[PDB]
Amino acid sequence: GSNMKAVCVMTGTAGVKGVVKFTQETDNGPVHVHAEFSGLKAGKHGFHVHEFGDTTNGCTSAGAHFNPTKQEHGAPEDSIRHVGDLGNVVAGADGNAVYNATDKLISLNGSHSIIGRSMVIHENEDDLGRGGHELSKVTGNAGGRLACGVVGLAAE
Amino acid sequence: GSNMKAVCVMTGTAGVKGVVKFTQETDNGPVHVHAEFSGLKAGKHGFHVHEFGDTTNGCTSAGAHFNPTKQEHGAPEDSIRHVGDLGNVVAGADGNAVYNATDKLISLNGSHSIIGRSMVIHENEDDLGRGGHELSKVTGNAGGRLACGVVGLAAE
Ligand SMILES: [Cu+2]
Ligand SMILES: [Cu+2]
Ligand SMILES: [Zn+2]
Ligand SMILES: [Zn+2]
Numbered sequence: 001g002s003n004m005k006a007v008c009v010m011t012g013t014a015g016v017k018g019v020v021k022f023t024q025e026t027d028n029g030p031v032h033v034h035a036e037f038s039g040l041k042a043g044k045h046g047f048h049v050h051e052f053g054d055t056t057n058g059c060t061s062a063g064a065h066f067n068p069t070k071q072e073h074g075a076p077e078d079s080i081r082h083v084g085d086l087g088n089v090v091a092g093a094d095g096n097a098v099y100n101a102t103d104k105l106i107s108l109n110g111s112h113s114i115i116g117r118s119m120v121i122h123e124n125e126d127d128l129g130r131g132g133h134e135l136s137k138v139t140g141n142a143g144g145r146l147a148c149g150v151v152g153l154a155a156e
Numbered sequence: 157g158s159n160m161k162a163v164c165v166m167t168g169t170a171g172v173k174g175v176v177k178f179t180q181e182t183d184n185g186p187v188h189v190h191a192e193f194s195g196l197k198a199g200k201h202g203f204h205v206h207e208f209g210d211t212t213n214g215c216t217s218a219g220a221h222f223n224p225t226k227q228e229h230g231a232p233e234d235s236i237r238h239v240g241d242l243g244n245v246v247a248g249a250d251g252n253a254v255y256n257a258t259d260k261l262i263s264l265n266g267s268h269s270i271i272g273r274s275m276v277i278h279e280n281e282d283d284l285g286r287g288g289h290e291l292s293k294v295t296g297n298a299g300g301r302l303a304c305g306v307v308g309l310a311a312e
Contacts, residue, residue: 006272007210009306019212053271053308054163056175063311115209116162116271116309150308152209153272155219 002027003108005154008119012059012147015039018097020119021154024108031106033086035099037121037147040091046126046142047099049084049106049151053116059145062118064138068111072137075128076103083112085140088126108153120148158183159264161310164275168215168303171195174253176275177310180264187262189242191255193277193303196247202282202298203255205240205262205307206274215301218274220294224267228293231284232259239268241296244282264309276304 008020018037024030035047051063065073066084074081083105091097106114126140127133135141162178174193180186191203206218221229222240230237239261247253262270282296283289291297 003272007212009211051309052311053306054310055165055308056163061311116159116307118308150209150306151272152211152274152306153207154210155208155217 003115003153004156006108006115006151007154008149008151010037010119010121010147010149012145014146016121016146018121018147022108027109028107030102030104031108033099033101033103035089035097037089037091037097038095040095040097040146042091042093042095044088044090044125045097045146046122046124046140047086047089048082048120048126049086049114050118050120050148053118053150055118055148055150059120059148062120062145062148066114066117073129073140076101078128081105084114087128089121114151115153117151118148119151120145122146159271159309160312162264162271162307163310164305164307166193166275166277166303166305168301170302172277172302174277174303178264178307183265184263186258186260187264189255189257189259191245193245193247193253194251196251196253196302198247198249198251200244200246200281201302202278202280202296203242203245204238204276204282205242205270206276206304209272209274209306211274211304211306215274215276215304218276218301218304222270222273229285229296232257234285237261243284245277270307271309273307274304275307276301278302
């Protein structure tokens, strides 16, 4: 039937790791996203679903932000955004981060399904397409890919 | 469009690692599987698709063999088998292994899709459901889980 839970274990070679959990109680309902990370520089870090669930080559094969609606990069709350745009994960002074959001664009089913794709957490802050740079409207100018993982179906 | 390529990076804490690549030409056509491993004890190792793409608790969270047809465990060539049954990976004296197979039951699309699920390589040989042991018809009596990874969509 409809997928109601998913998970993503994120790793890399930068000392950053984390786990993302997703719930979707109805086939077209909002998805609850919960993430925990460690090893991050204090502050904001870009967090998005990328197109491919290919983590080989140190996250460099994950592709661009997941964008089935062919839009420019934006903030999760914006009408204009990539389906994969989940904004920023905020790390405290200790390098740990807790993230929670309810999103209506990503899904665990249908065309916006993130199952089998990648979650990526970035080196720098996602400017939400508001930075004024060319990269702002593509990547949010979030810099390098610190950790990634493929999104898998979870028990429900 | 339909998925035509997938990849799975397998890791663990047992010194074993590998990578599996999958290709599928049509939505429900056969899937070509190619896998490479290192760090294995010489001999045969059970290799299957497990139901959940969850590796938060090592490979234990991956659940049991993927079995949408609700059959007993068997060899890939058997009529009675789990969709997830891919037989054995053979490791040489150097601990390396190469595996190739074309399978008609697993898919990268539809109800038998393995996207978002987990590939697992085991400690021992899969008896293909013929060993006459308690777990023969359940897991092939392949023992522990050496390495695993979630199956992601790859660039066509
Ligand atoms: Cu990203
Ligand atoms: Cu198995
Ligand atoms: Zn984006
Ligand atoms: Zn089986």
